[PDB]
Design a protein around this ligand. Sequence first.
Ligand SMILES: Nc1nc2c(ncn2[C@@H]2O[C@H](COP(=O)(O)OP(=O)(O)OP(O)(O)=S)[C@@H](O)[C@H]2O)c(=O)[nH]1
Ligand SMILES: [Mg+2]
Length: 178
Amino acid sequence: IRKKLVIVGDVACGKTCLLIVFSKDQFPEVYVPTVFENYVADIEVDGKQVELALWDTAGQEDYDRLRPLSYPDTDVILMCFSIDSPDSLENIPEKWTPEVKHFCPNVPIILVGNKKDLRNDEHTRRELAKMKQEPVKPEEGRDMANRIGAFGYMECSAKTKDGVREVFEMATRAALQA
Ligand SMILES: Nc1nc2c(ncn2[C@@H]2O[C@H](COP(=O)(O)OP(=O)(O)OP(O)(O)=S)[C@@H](O)[C@H]2O)c(=O)[nH]1
Ligand SMILES: [Mg+2]
């Protein structure tokens, strides 16, 4: 069974690394902003065999016009944000929810907190202290997921691999049913 999925979220929130890890097992060395890209990977969930189309998108403003060209026949969407950056969570209902909600209504959305490893990182906590902030708490991410009627919230780390597999299984599970 074939299904298509699109990933979206702020700049450098880990969109790409996540998709590459899951389908190539390697963690990209050099960070290069994405214009657009396509990937494929297979997965078995609840006995079903599913081929997956992974459409990567850009989080940059400069590309707002072309990003909507990948939305056409989407089955499920992974709306991502970063745990070290509280603002990227704020921009969920601001920019991404409206954009997606327009182009792709009636399509399941999986809210995804990324860079789960940086929640404990000391360097991270110290830099955010200047800004009188702190990493995102699992609760607030779940609240945001409910607020926008997401199919489910999930967290993970593409660096350590913590929870990466569960993210896609939930996506596939949602792309089949509903
Ligand atoms: N600590 C940590 N760093 C990560 C993780 N995933 C990605 N990164 C790092 O964060 C930076 C952003 O990664 P990337 O996936 O390219 O962002 P993006 O959201 O796709 O960004 P764009 O293409 O919209 S500009 C990179 O330097 C990458 O190595 C993660 O799980 N943990
Ligand atoms: Mg990218």
